Amino acid sequence: EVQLVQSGAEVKKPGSSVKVSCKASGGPFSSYGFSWVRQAPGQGLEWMGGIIPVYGTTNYAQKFQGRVTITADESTSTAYMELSSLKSEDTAVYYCARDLQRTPMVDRIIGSYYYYNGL
Amino acid sequence: VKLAGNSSLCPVSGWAIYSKDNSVRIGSKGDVFVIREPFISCSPLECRTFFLTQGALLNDKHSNGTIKDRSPYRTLMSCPIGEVPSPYNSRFESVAWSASACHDGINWLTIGISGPDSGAVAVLKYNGIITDTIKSWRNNILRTQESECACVNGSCFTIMTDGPSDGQASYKIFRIEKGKIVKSVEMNAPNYHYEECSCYPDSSEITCVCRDNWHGSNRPWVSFNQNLEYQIGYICSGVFGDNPRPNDKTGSCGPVSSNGANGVKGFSFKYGNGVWIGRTKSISSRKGFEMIWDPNGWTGTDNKFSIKQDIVGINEWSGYSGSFVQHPELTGLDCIRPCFWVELIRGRPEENTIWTSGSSISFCGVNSDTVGWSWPDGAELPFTIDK
Amino acid sequence: VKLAGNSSLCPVSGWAIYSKDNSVRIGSKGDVFVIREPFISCSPLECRTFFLTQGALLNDKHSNGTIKDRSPYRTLMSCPIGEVPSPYNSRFESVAWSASACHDGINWLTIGISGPDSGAVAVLKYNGIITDTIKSWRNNILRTQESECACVNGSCFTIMTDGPSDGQASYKIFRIEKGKIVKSVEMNAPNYHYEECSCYPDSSEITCVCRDNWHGSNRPWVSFNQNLEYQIGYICSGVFGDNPRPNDKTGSCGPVSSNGANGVKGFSFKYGNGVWIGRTKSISSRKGFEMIWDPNGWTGTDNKFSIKQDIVGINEWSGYSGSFVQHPELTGLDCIRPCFWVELIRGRPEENTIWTSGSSISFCGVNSDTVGWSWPDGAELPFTIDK
Amino acid sequence: VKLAGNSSLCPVSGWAIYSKDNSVRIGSKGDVFVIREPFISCSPLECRTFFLTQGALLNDKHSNGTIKDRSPYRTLMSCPIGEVPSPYNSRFESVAWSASACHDGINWLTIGISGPDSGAVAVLKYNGIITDTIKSWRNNILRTQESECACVNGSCFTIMTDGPSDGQASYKIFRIEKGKIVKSVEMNAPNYHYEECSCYPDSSEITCVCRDNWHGSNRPWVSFNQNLEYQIGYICSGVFGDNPRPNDKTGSCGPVSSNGANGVKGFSFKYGNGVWIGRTKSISSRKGFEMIWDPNGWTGTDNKFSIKQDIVGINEWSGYSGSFVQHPELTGLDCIRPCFWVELIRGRPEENTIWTSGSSISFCGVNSDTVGWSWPDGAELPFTIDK
Amino acid sequence: VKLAGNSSLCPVSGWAIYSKDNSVRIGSKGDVFVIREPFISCSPLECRTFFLTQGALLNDKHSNGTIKDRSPYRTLMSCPIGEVPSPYNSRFESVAWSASACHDGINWLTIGISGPDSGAVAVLKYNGIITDTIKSWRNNILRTQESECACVNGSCFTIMTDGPSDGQASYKIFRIEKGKIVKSVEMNAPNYHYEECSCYPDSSEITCVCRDNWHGSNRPWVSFNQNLEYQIGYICSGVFGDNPRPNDKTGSCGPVSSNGANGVKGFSFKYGNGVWIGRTKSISSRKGFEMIWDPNGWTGTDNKFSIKQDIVGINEWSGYSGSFVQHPELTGLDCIRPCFWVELIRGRPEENTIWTSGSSISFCGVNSDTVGWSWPDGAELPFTIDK
Numbered sequence A: 001e002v003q004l005v006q007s008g009a010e011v012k013k014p015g016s017s018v019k020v021s022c023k024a025s026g027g028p029f030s031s032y033g034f035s036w037v038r039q040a041p042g043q044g045l046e047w048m049g050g051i052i053p054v055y056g057t058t059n060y061a062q063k064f065q066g067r068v069t070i071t072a073d074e075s076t077s078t079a080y081m082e083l084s085s086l087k088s089e090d091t092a093v094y095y096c097a098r099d100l101q102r103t104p105m106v107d108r109i110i111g112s113y114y115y116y117n118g119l
Numbered sequence B, C, D, E: 001v002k003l004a005g006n007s008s009l010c011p012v013s014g015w016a017i018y019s020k021d022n023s024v025r026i027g028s029k030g031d032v033f034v035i036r037e038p039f040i041s042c043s044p045l046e047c048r049t050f051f052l053t054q055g056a057l058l059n060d061k062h063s064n065g066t067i068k069d070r071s072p073y074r075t076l077m078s079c080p081i082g083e084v085p086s087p088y089n090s091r092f093e094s095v096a097w098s099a100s101a102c103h104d105g106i107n108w109l110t111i112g113i114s115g116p117d118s119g120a121v122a123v124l125k126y127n128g129i130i131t132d133t134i135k136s137w138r139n140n141i142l143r144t145q146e147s148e149c150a151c152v153n154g155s156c157f158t159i160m161t162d163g164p165s166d167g168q169a170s171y172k173i174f175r176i177e178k179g180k181i182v183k184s185v186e187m188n189a190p191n192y193h194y195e196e197c198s199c200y201p202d203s204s205e206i207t208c209v210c211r212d213n214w215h216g217s218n219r220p221w222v223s224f225n226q227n228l229e230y231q232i233g234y235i236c237s238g239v240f241g242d243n244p245r246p247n248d249k250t251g252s253c254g255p256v257s258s259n260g261a262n263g264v265k266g267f268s269f270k271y272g273n274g275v276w277i278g279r280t281k282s283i284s285s286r287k288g289f290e291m292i293w294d295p296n297g298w299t300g301t302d303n304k305f306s307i308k309q310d311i312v313g314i315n316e317w318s319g320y321s322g323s324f325v326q327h328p329e330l331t332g333l334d335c336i337r338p339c340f341w342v343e344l345i346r347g348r349p350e351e352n353t354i355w356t357s358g359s360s361i362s363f364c365g366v367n368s369d370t371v372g373w374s375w376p377d378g379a380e381l382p383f384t385i386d387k
């Protein structure tokens, strides 16, 4: 099966930025959607953004537009999430989760294209 | 002289192979364009292979990341059939990442779409001279047949789509004369989705078989006359023509939602209530190709068919397919004969390379003995640039 | 205007060199098709070199295992004489692993055979437009001349073989008019074997010299008129023309069984009771080439001949050979002049490479001073791809 | 038949993309000339891309140090539009390190300048036959438009400069008929500087927009009739057209000395007192390109303009630009339509390579919907030869 | 229509540069024939560059040992002027290691010499059809002009040599009409030596300037009329034209024995008692080239001349040079204009490579301003194949 290994814990002052890695220690990486979900302590799940590395496309939630950046590295099978202008309300546990099915074939690729079957 | 186009489709009973360029195989050594979305179109004198280049050559570092269908470097170019799309034998047509081209009988008409996603502009050329332009009216990527347009009596017609690829969009029919758009009609087709139509003239009218990328596993169609009065519908046959699709089952004259999400450019030839259906052999991936004759498939919903001819083996890569006709002006026959081409996509996303390109095969309908076989791309991947 | 073809063969007294393409040598650096079975055919305006590519280029990995004569990637293409068969100067004709082509005087006729071994279909094109098809009638590999066909008065003729290569097979004559098969006759030739015929028109008739791959070291022949009434027989000369063969000995007007097993495509020109014989110099391998004039070899069984002209040295590689004519319409003469080409096979199975290809030389008959020499391929093998 | 040229410029409201050759990108793999100073010129039948080669190919060691604009190896050559300038598709015109070419309607006129700096000679060819020569009259490098010349009624005109590039020089107008210089006039223009003029015919006269390399950040211009009576001046608009230049400010109908030192070849189309200005986006480097419509810019000194259309992004390399027209003989219109090309310089001095070359894009004016975008060179530098 | 050729040579006062192919420089990357002995010849419509290939491409291993002037792989081919001799743009003419070609006004006449040294046969082609042959009569290598032949009134003339290169040989004049040799005369020239003549028509007659390889440092010449009545002699000028030669000294109307041993192919244009002499700048090696006008050099023995124009610098490699004319049928003038080409030999024996090849420059005579300069080959040797 597939294993997603994330970077260690992080502590930041407000106004700074943080970048978290997500190394897909398995097969899937290239043609699979990767999402970044955060969860404040004692609160619900909140989806920040997603990426499809084969198509080089990203989709961000309207709450995080402008200060979140999700990048991929097709060589090392690693995904990244960078959140800038950090506020104290951003204190949460940040998860990265692959999708369940291979992405469909898109001939007309929208720059913000993303698919979601289930993480 | 002008192409009359008042002849009906010749009735066919098979498909004889017409051309095979072996591009990607020859591209491993020679200087060959990285291409995608090729199509064949014929004049009353010759036939040509149009294609959208990526401004790069195979086995070159500039073929990296050439999945992306839209870039300022893509150009519509053309070369003789069965010939490799090389910069040394290719004629330039227009700067485009979405194109269409046909010959009214006196001059090549080419339609090139370039520009940003919100402001794409289709450049119309007649004899290589810019004759008209049309701008995206819904500011979501403007796209066209990626196959030949259809000319009748001196007027050529095409289909363009503006809007979402995963939802309801806007579709327009155009009537071009000597490269000038003279009439256009937006189709009143709610819950329909039209993309990358394969239009062919049929005895003074035109019928386009298209691709439903939004909720359709059967193929939508639209037919119209010179005044652009039109009729819409879906191929009712239970032999589903899109890819992906479900297994063969009870069809529908409306869009079939099962596996109705994104599809593949295709074609079909309607003969009364029957239909010649070209489709992939696989249900999920773009593998194999075959021609199926359903004698009642145009208006009936059953899955029964009477003739099937193999084109590409189920294990080997296939891709876009489109129709192209050979008019009596060119062949000397008394009816407009139908033909088709098949794109053989190699590389990304299915294969471990840094590039995506395609070769082409083509077949023409004959009323004589034919045979099924597998004419695949044949390139051994990955290439040296992929290590 | 149509090619009349009512002139007799010009009488010849030698052979002057006509072309040499130096393909494989230039293939070491340039972009050159891996080819095999080349032949020359002329229109009333120009002469062209047809060939069966392998969908790959020399010194490329896709030239691996290209011994196999049949694949879905082989295509019939043509380029000007003496020119290298490159994708940058070659015109596409048809998808084929067995082909034939000739010019009736108004348009190129091409015959391309592709498909499975049990269902091979020959696609006939007139001016690149598919005009007819013919399917294998014995379901064992369908094959044709691999040299030019012969046109008289507007009708072109060819030979096709269906059945075993090591036994009795089926042989048919065709009479094509503007790419449409108008008449065909199956030859009744028991104990005969016909393969890869070299047909030339001779005073309103056609005589084909062929290859007996089953039990024949002399060459079988068949001559016929426009109504396809035909004569059959073998070259009686004791100067055996096939390869392999025995040493020169007493010949036979029937098939000579000694070393009668598989042969090489060849040709011959009959002049009354005499014959111009082109053959290899070696008796076992495909090495060297020479032209021999036997003044009574067509009807006599002795081994005596009066003239011999060296073409390729006995130590250097040779291969298929075939006839091609230049009609008075092209030369301005008052008789149809004979010419011939020689294929120079390099690589497998005789050489330590991963590929097999060939270059070509050609000679035309003249009634003037000539000289014998050795014009070999000249490529230094193995190539860099073979290491 | 001769090109009349008595029509006025078609009025334009935008620019539709006409060609893009993707040379340097394809030069990374294919065999492509190292070129610089390209320009387009059209006959009544076709359009061609002329260019000055360096006698060398991209990614080859002979492309080292190819900054130097003058060498005995540079040649003026031409190929179809949108095609890559390869030795396999390029026609030879003349040996030149400074060139100009136009079609009077019956035959290509080419002007090639070669020789030493003190004795440079311009070779004039009409249909490739040398028809006239003209020698440097001030013994300091003789140079010409590096764009198309202008033909009216059968007479073609050009501008040549002899003397210093950083000071007052000598400028002459020529009137060529069938390649023979029939009249010339030296311009009485003290304090003016003319280099690399972009000349277009406009209703039986010619107006050239040029480059002031000595003290000018606005563009000098000269207009003349068939008798070579001329008028001189500078574009008064505060939208400065040269590169480098100052920020947009109050302009002058004389030379603007601020950032008046060396500039870039450019063009402009005058319409009454309006002007379509093509210029770089950057003020210092050769980056980006845009078209600006100033409705009073030809005679007014303010910096206000009403229309701007993006051509190349401000961050991507640009270079020479020049005008070329399509006459009614070619387009069938009733007015001479304006177009223009943009050279995209890559490599030295701005980039870490051993070479300098360029690709081209072109646009034609239309009175219909257009869009602004960025169509840059797109080559990934450095190349393998630069390591 | 036929080339009349009854005009006298246009009188000239300089030389304007006509073409430069930059072959070897482009050959370092592109696919370029290894050539030697190139020459230009013109039809009433175009001019072409003929050359003798070696059946191999530059920077390829098959270009090893290509010093040897004679091999069964050498072929005469032609391409447009100023273009690189590539297999993708070169037309095949004949198999030859010694060649000549000219256009009578209706069809290209080509003469190709191949075969063994003792039995060489020259193949004559008119419109690519073999029209005649001529076999060596002295059984010692048969050779010809290696430059264009001269056609007058429909009859073309050439010179061939059979016998020793270091002693008395046999020389013949031929009168070909439509590729058929109609008359020949062996010259009665004891103590003379003729090789590689440069023949040009001059007012219904022909005058050839040739190379004395046996005992001559001045150039021998022969002039003749249509009936082949001839006159022989040597250029009397003390400005010696061969290479090697002695310093300029008192000349002779007979052969000058000082440095009279083997020479270089050259040319000269006679104007009354004057002569335009093309020669190398160096006295020992093949370095540099220049044009010298000696107003009495044809009949006078002094070393005085009045005009000298530099062509190639004394430090840079030169080689064969030859004449070629442009008839009034092509130029529209009232006199047959003279031009010339220069071969720039690179590699062996003078340079450290495994190969020998050459590029070409050409000039045409004009009565207008010209300039002297150096237009060398420009290739940086050794190439990558030489390491």
Ligand SMILES: *[C@@H]1O[C@H](CO)[C@@H](O[C@@H]2O[C@H](CO)[C@@H](O[C@@H]3O[C@H](CO)[C@@H](O)[C@H](O)[C@@H]3O)[C@H](O)[C@H]2NC(C)=O)[C@H](O)[C@H]1NC(C)=O
Pocket (backbone or CB within 6 Å): A072, A073, A074, A075, B061, B064, B065, B354
């Ligand atoms: C073709 O294009 C792809 C992009 O689609 C290029 O992929 C990029 O590859 C480089 C390495 O070759 C990656 O860089 C690495 O970054 C990590 C930090 O994240 C660093 O630790 C490594 O040492 C390395 O520098 C880069 O992330 C990756 N980018 C993407 C978007 O995948 C590929 O290199 C290109 N190949 C060619 C031949 O042009």
Ligand SMILES: *[C@@H]1O[C@H](CO)[C@@H](O[C@@H]2O[C@H](CO)[C@@H](O[C@@H]3O[C@H](CO)[C@@H](O)[C@H](O)[C@@H]3O)[C@H](O)[C@H]2NC(C)=O)[C@H](O)[C@H]1NC(C)=O
Pocket (backbone or CB within 6 Å): C061, C064, C065, C354
């Ligand atoms: C060209 O095609 C031939 C096939 O005709 C390829 O030959 C194959 O070569 C590989 C090795 O290169 C052989 O694999 C070996 O298998 C043995 C087990 O039998 C294993 O112990 C070795 O380590 C190796 O993996 C393979 O058997 C052989 N196949 C045949 C049918 O001969 C050849 O590799 C191709 N070359 C190129 C350049 O494409």
Ligand SMILES: [Ca+2]
Pocket (backbone or CB within 6 Å): B212, B213, B214, B215, B216, B217, B242, B243, B244, B259, B260, B261, B262, B263, B264
């Ligand atoms: Ca679908």
Ligand SMILES: [Ca+2]
Pocket (backbone or CB within 6 Å): B237, B294, B295, B296, B297, B300, B302, B303, B304, B305
């Ligand atoms: Ca059914």
Ligand SMILES: [Ca+2]
Pocket (backbone or CB within 6 Å): C212, C213, C214, C215, C216, C217, C242, C243, C244, C259, C260, C261, C262, C263, C264
């Ligand atoms: Ca046999």
Ligand SMILES: [Ca+2]
Pocket (backbone or CB within 6 Å): C294, C295, C296, C297, C300, C302, C303, C304, C305
């Ligand atoms: Ca005998």
Ligand SMILES: [Ca+2]
Pocket (backbone or CB within 6 Å): D211, D212, D213, D214, D215, D216, D217, D242, D243, D244, D259, D260, D261, D262, D263, D264
């Ligand atoms: Ca300036």
Ligand SMILES: [Ca+2]
Pocket (backbone or CB within 6 Å): D294, D295, D296, D297, D300, D302, D303, D304, D305
């Ligand atoms: Ca203003």
Ligand SMILES: [Ca+2]
Pocket (backbone or CB within 6 Å): E212, E213, E214, E215, E216, E217, E242, E243, E244, E259, E260, E261, E262, E263, E264
């Ligand atoms: Ca000498």
Ligand SMILES: [Ca+2]
Pocket (backbone or CB within 6 Å): E294, E295, E296, E297, E300, E302, E303, E304, E305
């Ligand atoms: Ca003198």
